[PDB]
Amino acid sequence: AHPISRYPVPELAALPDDIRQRILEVQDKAGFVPNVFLTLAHRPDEFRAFFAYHDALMLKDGGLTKGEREMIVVATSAANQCLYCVVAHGAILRIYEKKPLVADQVAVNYLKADIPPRQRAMLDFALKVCKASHEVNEADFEALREHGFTDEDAWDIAAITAFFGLSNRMANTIGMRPNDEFFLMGRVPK
Amino acid sequence: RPAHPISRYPVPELAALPDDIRQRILEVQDKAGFVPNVFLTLAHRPDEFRAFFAYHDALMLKDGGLTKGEREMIVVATSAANQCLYCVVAHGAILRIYEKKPLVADQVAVNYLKADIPPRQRAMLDFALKVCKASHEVNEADFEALREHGFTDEDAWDIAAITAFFGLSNRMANTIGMRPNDEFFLMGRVP
Amino acid sequence: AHPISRYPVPELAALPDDIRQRILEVQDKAGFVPNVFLTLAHRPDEFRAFFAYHDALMLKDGGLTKGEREMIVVATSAANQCLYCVVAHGAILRIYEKKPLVADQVAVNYLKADIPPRQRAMLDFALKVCKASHEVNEADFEALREHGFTDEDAWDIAAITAFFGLSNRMANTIGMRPNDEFFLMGRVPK
Amino acid sequence: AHPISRYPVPELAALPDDIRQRILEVQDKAGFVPNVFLTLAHRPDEFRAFFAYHDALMLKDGGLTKGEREMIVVATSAANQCLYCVVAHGAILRIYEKKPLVADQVAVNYLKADIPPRQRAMLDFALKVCKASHEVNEADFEALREHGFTDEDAWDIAAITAFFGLSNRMANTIGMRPNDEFFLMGRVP
Amino acid sequence: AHPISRYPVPELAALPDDIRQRILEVQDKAGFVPNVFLTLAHRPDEFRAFFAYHDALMLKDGGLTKGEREMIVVATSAANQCLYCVVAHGAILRIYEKKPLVADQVAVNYLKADIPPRQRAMLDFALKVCKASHEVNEADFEALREHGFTDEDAWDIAAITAFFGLSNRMANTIGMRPNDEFFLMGRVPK
Amino acid sequence: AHPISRYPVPELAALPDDIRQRILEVQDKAGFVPNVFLTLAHRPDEFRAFFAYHDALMLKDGGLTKGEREMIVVATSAANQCLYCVVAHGAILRIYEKKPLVADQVAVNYLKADIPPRQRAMLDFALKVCKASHEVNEADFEALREHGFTDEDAWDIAAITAFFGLSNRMANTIGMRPNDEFFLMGRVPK
Numbered sequence A, C, E, F: 001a002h003p004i005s006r007y008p009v010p011e012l013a014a015l016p017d018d019i020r021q022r023i024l025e026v027q028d029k030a031g032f033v034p035n036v037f038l039t040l041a042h043r044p045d046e047f048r049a050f051f052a053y054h055d056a057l058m059l060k061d062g063g064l065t066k067g068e069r070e071m072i073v074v075a076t077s078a079a080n081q082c083l084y085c086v087v088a089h090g091a092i093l094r095i096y097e098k099k100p101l102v103a104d105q106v107a108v109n110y111l112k113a114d115i116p117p118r119q120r121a122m123l124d125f126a127l128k129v130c131k132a133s134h135e136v137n138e139a140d141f142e143a144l145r146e147h148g149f150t151d152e153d154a155w156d157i158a159a160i161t162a163f164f165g166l167s168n169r170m171a172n173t174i175g176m177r178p179n180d181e182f183f184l185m186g187r188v189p190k
Numbered sequence B: 001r002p003a004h005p006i007s008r009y010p011v012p013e014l015a016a017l018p019d020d021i022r023q024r025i026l027e028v029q030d031k032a033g034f035v036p037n038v039f040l041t042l043a044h045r046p047d048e049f050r051a052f053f054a055y056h057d058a059l060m061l062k063d064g065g066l067t068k069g070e071r072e073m074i075v076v077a078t079s080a081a082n083q084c085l086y087c088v089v090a091h092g093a094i095l096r097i098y099e100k101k102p103l104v105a106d107q108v109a110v111n112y113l114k115a116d117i118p119p120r121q122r123a124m125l126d127f128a129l130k131v132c133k134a135s136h137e138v139n140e141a142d143f144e145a146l147r148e149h150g151f152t153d154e155d156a157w158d159i160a161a162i163t164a165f166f167g168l169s170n171r172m173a174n175t176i177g178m179r180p181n182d183e184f185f186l187m188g189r190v191p
Numbered sequence D: 001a002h003p004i005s006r007y008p009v010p011e012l013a014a015l016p017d018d019i020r021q022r023i024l025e026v027q028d029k030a031g032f033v034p035n036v037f038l039t040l041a042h043r044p045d046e047f048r049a050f051f052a053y054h055d056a057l058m059l060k061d062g063g064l065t066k067g068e069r070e071m072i073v074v075a076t077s078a079a080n081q082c083l084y085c086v087v088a089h090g091a092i093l094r095i096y097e098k099k100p101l102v103a104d105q106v107a108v109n110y111l112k113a114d115i116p117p118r119q120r121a122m123l124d125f126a127l128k129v130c131k132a133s134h135e136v137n138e139a140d141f142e143a144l145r146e147h148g149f150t151d152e153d154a155w156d157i158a159a160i161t162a163f164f165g166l167s168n169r170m171a172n173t174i175g176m177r178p179n180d181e182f183f184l185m186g187r188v189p
Helices: A017-030 A035-040 A044-058 A066-079 A083-097 A102-112 A117-135 A138-146 A151-174 A180-184 B019-032 B037-042 B046-060 B068-081 B085-099 B104-114 B119-137 B140-148 B153-176 B182-186 C017-030 C035-040 C044-058 C066-079 C083-097 C102-112 C117-135 C138-145 C151-174 C180-184 D017-030 D035-040 D044-058 D066-079 D083-097 D102-112 D117-135 D138-146 D151-174 D180-184 E017-030 E035-040 E044-058 E066-079 E083-097 E102-112 E117-135 E138-145 E151-174 E180-184 F017-030 F035-040 F044-058 F066-079 F083-097 F102-112 F117-135 F138-146 F151-174 F180-184
Strands: none
Touching (some): A017 A044, A035 A044, A035 A151, A044 A066, A066 A083, A083 A102, A083 A151, A083 A180, A102 A117, A102 C083, A102 D117, A117 A151, A117 E102, A138 A151, A151 B153, B019 B046, B037 B085, B046 B068, B046 B153, B068 B085, B085 B182, B085 E102, B104 E083, B104 F117, B119 B140, B119 B153, B119 C102, C017 C035, C035 C083, C044 D044, C066 C102, C066 C117, C066 C151, C083 C102, C117 C138, C117 C151, C138 C151, C151 D117, C151 D151, D017 D035, D017 D044, D035 D044, D035 D151, D044 D066, D066 D083, D066 D117, D066 D151, D083 D151, D083 F102, D102 D117, D138 D151, E017 E035, E035 E044, E035 E083, E044 E066, E044 E151, E044 F044, E066 E102, E066 E117, E117 E138, E117 F151, E138 E151, E151 F151, F017 F035, F017 F044, F035 F083, F035 F151, F044 F151, F066 F083, F066 F151, F083 F102, F083 F151, F102 F117, F138 F151
């Protein structure tokens, strides 16, 4: 087995109960524990805040579909050359939208991915928040509204981009390894 | 003198907010004399507010190999690289206060390579900057370099975490037009 | 059926004998025709020279294994954000290496791929020929030689990088589309 | 004499005949042999594939003029800091255009070269293909059309950019040295 | 005390009297001698050429206000990450505009400083000369004219940018330290 | 005849006597007037300080030969893509060095110019001051000392680089044209 982190990966039995429950609850749904859970459990207080933030953005009722949210995470993680997040969320993207080819395209060159203008423009904003938020101006929000987004959708695209930047940096810094399961998941329909 | 807007987004009234959030805002006010705008602007999305400050507290309030000033120093250099006006200005004030060095935050914001800091701290910021702009390139030699200056790998995680979270903060700050309070600009400049 | 080129694509019948002969040869071996053949057959003389150059590099006897050559292609194409070549050779790399996870790693961040230092080094060089060839110097070759390569291997790396650099630009310019087959090919072992 | 490559340079004596032929042919219609032939003759198969592709682009009847083809090479090569190609095709550019100053301009900053907006628009594309092809969209082909180019012309511009990127990377990697003759050629009408 | 330069700082008594008078003139004007004077005096011919040029740009009567000229310096100095110039001219900018916040805003992100569109356009052009002067075209001048800048004002902007680009590089090369006084100057209005 | 500036070029009869004198002294010397003189004449106060700085550096006696000084200008100009300075000073460089090929080499890729390690090392420091002076450190000076350059020689390199970048920006902003004479000058010896 290849190491999943550069840092100590604690034993499920050594972890506090609430952390342990979130990990098991994810194993139940997924069938395995994604390595982000295990690797970030090295620092319990950060694990708690990381997933709290994650949930607040990814589980909320919002203008962005669950698929679109993961698509944001894939395009921005590509930009940061983040192995784990590209691979982990590429799979989920494929599942959530039932499009086996789309995550690959968004990761290699989203400019040429088989997605609609509304989504392309969604990502354009995400890439700007990612690499150059200092230049975010009113024309940027106008561009999103031209496609039916509200400014609250803008905040949403921005917040996902922001938080998965936190996550890409942590994953790259510790060499967080994507589970084998993610590499094939969502590629074969039905 | 009508005040400048602090966000391009709505700012809720302290009264129209959850008591837990209201209490955190009052605790910071009753200890600073004013409410930093990050609390009021993020209070537009209460669940994100709670998750932000909890993450913030986990890194900036823990016991650790980094001093309180050093942690703020990391924020200032990384924020300066992202050209985050709120963060550079807000955390420069706090850096000056913690270090008791009125000049250090401006040096770190403009070019930390010439800041009045020891090579241990310059090394710490070299790493922070790598995580900040090229984390995918982080390797074992980057950890070795920090260790050469007396850091442990647990300290290396603290640096990287702070960089990571304020890269989030920066991005939100910049997207919403988060405006630094007037008090930060002058705070810590007079010994 | 999405289009595979921004330019006209000719009918196999329409093409010269040797071109159709080369295309039939691959149709039979693979069970389909990669789009690169069809889309470049729009300009018969360039097709001829493109594939002659390709064969001279990828079919020669040499110090790089077939899978190492494809590895060079995935890492440099990722650099040029070439959807066609990343996806296409990504599949081919998985076949030759019998490693289903490697092509994704090489395409996203080859610095974290599951490859030995000799292969990392081979890629470090390729990446310099790709993005900064004017800086290539004697110490670059000396670095390779310390990993066991010969100067003739180094040329091979450089040459693959040069040629696929050409291919990336043609692919990208015309929006050459990777075949659906390539996205799953090599991910489930035989 | 300075070395023309960091790699071995075969003797014409020991080369396949078809390769000697094109070298000895160059020696007549030029009086000397550009180092690109001799340096790439180290690998005969690559030599053959390389010149065929070159001839396929540069010698075809097409929408771009001979001089315009060279102008694309000089500008893209200049962007890849390719000493060999900038200098060698700067010369040929001067010979075709009969304009001794144009290559230098195209090499330093084509944006200020003495050329009409049509040729500048063309080179704007060439430089997009050169450094950011993944971003090439319909608006780029539309831009060229406004100056009277067709999409076939765009392909030719892109293919020249693509090929000389190969040529540049090879030059740069082996230290291919421009012949002395190229530095002065075409500077006197 | 911290050294103000990597190089020797000549004593007054040792300097040519004309050079000594400019230094003593500013001592009276400011109440201290900015380290630019003291440190460049190491090379008297250059001190003369330098301050002559400075005065030709910053003392001329012309299109740009005195605060506007300082704004160009701080924003362009911020982009060459010049510690000395950013800090020194930020101080002056605060005084001339009577706006204690505007310098830090211009230094970090002029796009978000409290300045009219005219001043933003001005600095857009300054930053183009500063980082990409080779791309300066007629559309650049056209944009400026829309805000009230003549071609002679555009020259002034470019000229300031260019000269302070020289200044930044000497400051940066020698470690030209800013005077303690500039850090606090202009923050509490008179 | 192509315009030599985007701005007015004054007639020498219309200029101050000292300015007309300098302009006729160079004509005496060169047999033509470099367009830098005529175009900057548009601003006599700046013309004076500009040529006063130029002389302070280019005419001084110091550790750099006259050729090496031009070589710094051509390498750094080239990096600012300054048509005027590259072409003009390339010509001068050919003269001073009696090396017809050397300026082209330095202009395109100095890393491959026919120059010894000492000169390559002087240009490495020049390009650093040119594009990243904020990162100049004690090790860059040490690198120059190993090649025999003194503290004052380093200042000369840094100073020429700084001043010619002011020149590049000004040439670039006004579309300063180089004279037909510089294009062929020095390419043929004796």
